[PDB]
Paper text:
Glycoprotein B plays a crucial role in the viral entry process and is indispensable for HSV replication and pathogenesis. Similar to the humanized antibody HDIT101, which we have previously employed in clinical phase I and II trials, HDIT102 targets domain I of the fusion protein gB of HSV-1 and HSV-2. Domain I is part of the outermost exposure on the gB surface in the prefusion conformation and contributes to the structural rearrangements that gB undergoes during the fusion process, making it an attractive target for antibody therapy. To determine the exact epitopes of HDIT101 and HDIT102 in gB, we solved the cryo-EM co-structures of Fab bound to HSV-1F or HSV-2G recombinant gB ectodomain in post-fusion conformation at resolutions of 3.12Å to 3.45Å.
We have solved here for the first time the cryoEM structure of the HSV-2 gB ectodomain in complex with two different Fabs binding to domain I at a resolution between 3.1–3.5Å. HDIT101 heavy and light chain CDR residues were in close proximity with HSV-1F/HSV-2G gB residues Y303/Y295, R304/R296, E305/E297, H308/H300 and D323/D315, while HDIT102 CDR residues were near HSV-1F/HSV-2G gB residues D199/D191, K204/K196, R304/R296, K320/K312, Y326/Y318 and R335/R327. In the HDIT102 co-structure HSV-2 gB D191 made polar contact at 2.8Å and 2.7Å distance with HC CDR3 T100a and T100b, respectively. HSV-2 gB K196 made polar contact at 2.5Å distance with LC CDR2 D51 and gB R327 formed polar contact with LC CDR2 D53 and non-polar contact with LC CDR2 Y50. HSV-2 gB Y318 made polar contact with HC CDR3 D101. The distance between HSV-2 gB R296 to HDIT102 CDR residues was > 3.5Å and no polar bonds were observed. The dissociation rate for Fab102 was dramatically decreased compared to Fab101 for both HSV-1F (Fab102 vs. Fab101, 8.85 × 10–5 s−1 vs. 3.13 × 10–3 s−1) and HSV-2G (Fab102 vs. Fab101, 2.86 × 10–5 s−1 vs. 3.79 × 10–3 s−1), mirroring the pattern observed with HDIT102 IgG. After five rounds of replication, presence of suboptimal concentrations of HDIT101 generated resistance mutant HSV-1F R304Q and HSV-2G R296Q, respectively, while propagation of the viruses under increasing doses of HDIT102 generated resistance escape mutants HSV-1F R335Q and HSV-2G R327W, respectively. In contrast, 451/451 (100%) of gB sequences from HSV-1 isolates had R335, however 55/368 (14.9%) of gB sequences from HSV-2 isolates possessed Q327, the same site that changed and developed resistance in vitro when HSV-2G was propagated in the presence of increasing doses of HDIT102.
Residue numbers in the entry:
A (entry chain F): 7 to 125
B (entry chain G), G (entry chain L): 2 to 106
C (entry chain C), F (entry chain B): 675 to 719
D (entry chain A): 173 to 451
E (entry chain B): 173 to 273
């Protein structure tokens, strides 16, 4: 499977950003989608996971109430949407196939190219 | 719900590099080690504490016991200079290690 | 002269000659929970 | 004296099959499962929950590999003139051979148990139209599954699509494969270098001197699209015909057109490649 | 935790097959039969005797018709630190193919 | 002319056509105690 | 342990006739309705509360609920003048109804 994300986004503080991740090669319902962001020169910061088969999601404690994770099965796509942006949200966001419904011990074996979001 | 990693590890090209990842009862969790070159998505180099994905050289190795996981890079090449992350799943979230920047002298 | 396929007993006749079939009996018996029971429901009071 | 021995088989949950058995190679010492419409949990040795290694089973002749955690049954310590209950939980993993028959809407295991789900049921490329007799939450198709050998402890590098089904009594897991290139309603029986085809009485006679067999077919061909699940006939016919032509008639004859397919009395499918000599 | 599940198949008497099942289409909620040389009686849900309608069973492929009265097993209500017993009586009628040689 | 032995299905093919074999299922099922259990050991406190 | 019936019922030839049979918990019993014309043995016209024997016309109908069983005759012809009895089995003995004489006017 291959994960292809949308383009870079330039926004203003307090706005909302929807990042798209399209899976190609598989039905995309057979694994989970983990969204993880990395700031400029900082370490990896996990954001959440989503089960495209059922729509079940699980977010980080620090991202609860600001992240909405949804899907479009027909177009084989997963969307992560951030609300209430601030200055430290300028980061590269990656969608991966990782833990979640399919098993909490899974690995983030396949990654997306990542989208750069600047506020 | 946090993993402790050394900020930086410096090893000569001929020698071997050890990267540690500390946590409370991390021996009961599967530690996955990711490698990241600058301006690239992380690439999985170790998964399930001992295993190497396809196309990963035999140099990389992993262990996980008690309260410590360790990634060992034998015959550290000049191209092994990267940031390494340890990931486990704690409670209902995956915690990521602070990241270790391996420097090849 | 044309020879047609002729046989006294077919494979199906030989299989049906048996009084009990283990596979069919097991298949019918192991649908008992799926037929006369509600497997998925969990009752907690 | 034993007043009773309640023996039950409980399924291993998905989160224990993937996260415990496949990841760490261990199994939980507590069995939590739904039985008789009630959530029941049994603690091994009436102790706290613990992860136990899955050690190889005792070797038996003509048996598949098996793993288990416990080898002795726990019985209560003696207390004079009281009924005492003792719980034992033995986590058992068994590689088995599963068999299915047409129309492949269900399969059986080597233990005599039935699974009322098509072996090709899944989530991709029309696998969700296959037969399933269970609830949607009893089935899980994991992709990017890295199987772990329980003896050599060597993870497989190539990911596989793994179906997991939690029946009330056990949990079966098997690698998903597409139905069309896996099953077939016809099997190759004979490969004949020389079947002379003769046209007479508005019929074709295919005579083979090697096996001493004459087949009678109608003049018209048999449409391969009319065969149910008949994707193997074409491939096997082309492969065998090419092999035999290369073996025997490469230097003397040439093929005349694409292989034709005929139906012969008694229900025999003949793939025929006519040949013409260099003259 | 289940400490034991005694499962048995009792016969439906003649006076219940004709008077209840064939006549009214219902089945008694009590199973009174002879097992191990003893008159044993079971009450569904440990309740009073009642007539329960025989409704069609769930459809399974390549299976004959069948009817049953109860769908859920009865388990005892939770009382802390006590062994408790619960009875379930499910009257099952199945059309079957019989073979003789 | 030499007539070679020919048959559409062998005995093994016909016996393997069955989905479940009672003998093999019983042989595998009755080794469960010998494989996954210690029959000989007796524990006395 | 008794069944009560109206002594007589009079209905017009065009209309429908309704005959009631009372009893305590009659809905737990299988009421059989017998028709008896003078100088003849009774003929069974309804059995098991909702069924007609072979040869009985579709006009007849039966119902049983609570403390009342009911026999309904639709398009009551002139040949339906007879006595109608409701029979059950009550504690080791069958109980017959008092008898209802249906008369067409």
């Amino acid at each position: 499977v291959q994960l292809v994300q949308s383009g870079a986004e330039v926004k203003t503080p307090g706005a909302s950003v929807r990042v798209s991740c399209k899976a190609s090669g598989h039905t995309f319902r057979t694994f989970d989608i983990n969204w993880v962001r990395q700031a400029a020169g900082q370490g990896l910061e996990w954001m959440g996971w989503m089960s495209p088969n059922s729509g079940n999601t699980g977010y980080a404690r620090q991202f609860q109430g600001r992240v909405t994770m949804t899907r479009n099965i027909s177009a084989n796509t997963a969307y992560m949407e951030l609300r209430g942006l601030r200055f430290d949200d300028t980061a590269v966001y990656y969608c991966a196939r990782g833990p979640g419904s399919t098993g909490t011990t899974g690995s983030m074996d396949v990654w997306g190219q990542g989208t750069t979001v600047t506020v | 719900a946090g993993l402790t990693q050394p900020p930086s590890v410096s090893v000569a090209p001929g020698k071997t590099a050890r990267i540690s990842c500390g946590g409370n009862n991390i021996g009961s969790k599967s530690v996955h080690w990711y490698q990241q070159k600058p301006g690239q998505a992380p690439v999985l180099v170790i998964y399930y504490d001992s295993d190497r994905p396809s196309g990963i050289p035999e140099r990389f190795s992993g262990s996980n016991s008690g309260n410590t996981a360790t990634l060992t890079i034998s015959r550290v090449e000049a191209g092994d200079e990267a940031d390494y992350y340890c990931q486990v799943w704690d409670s209902g979230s995956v915690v990521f290690g602070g990241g270790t920047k391996l420097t090849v002298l | 002269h044309e020879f047609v396929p002729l046989e006294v007993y077919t494979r199906h006749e030989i299989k049906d000659s048996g009084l009990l079939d283990y596979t069919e009996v097991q298949r019918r018996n192991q649908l008992h929970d799926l037929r006369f029971a509600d497997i998925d429901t969990v009752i907690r009071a | 004296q034993f007043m009773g021995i309640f023996e039950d088989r409980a399924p291993v949950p998905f989160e224990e099959v993937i996260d415990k058995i496949n990841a760490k190679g261990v199994c939980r010492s507590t069995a939590k499962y739904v039985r008789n419409n009630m959530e029941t949990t049994a603690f091994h040795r009436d102790d706290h929950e613990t992860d136990m290694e899955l050690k190889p089973a005792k070797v038996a002749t003509r048996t598949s590999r098996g793993w288990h955690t416990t080898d002795l049954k726990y019985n209560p310590s003696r207390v004079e003139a009281f009924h005492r209950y003792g719980t034992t939980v033995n986590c058992i993993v068994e590689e088995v051979d599963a068999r299915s028959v047409y129309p492949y809407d269900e399969f059986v295991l080597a233990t005599g148990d039935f699974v009322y789900m098509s072996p090709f049921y899944g989530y991709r490329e029309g696998s969700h139209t296959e037969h399933t007799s269970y609830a949607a939450d009893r089935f899980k198709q994991v992709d990017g599954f890295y199987a772990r050998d329980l003896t050599t402890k060597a993870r497989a590098t190539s990911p596989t699509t793994r179906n997991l089904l939690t029946t009330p009594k056990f949990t079966v897991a098997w690698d998903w494969v597409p139905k069309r290139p896996a099953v077939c309603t016809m099997t190759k029986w004979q490969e004949v270098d020389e079947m002379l085809r003769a046209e007479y009485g508005g019929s074709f006679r295919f005579s083979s001197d090697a096996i001493s067999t004459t087949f009678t077919t109608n003049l018209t061909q048999y449409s391969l699209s009319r065969v149910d699940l008949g994707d193997c006939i074409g491939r096997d016919a082309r492969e065998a015909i090419d092999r035999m032509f290369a073996r025997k008639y490469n230097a003397t004859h040439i093929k005349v057109g694409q292989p034709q397919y005929y139906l012969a009395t008694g229900g025999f499918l003949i793939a025929y490649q006519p040949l013409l000599s260099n003259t």
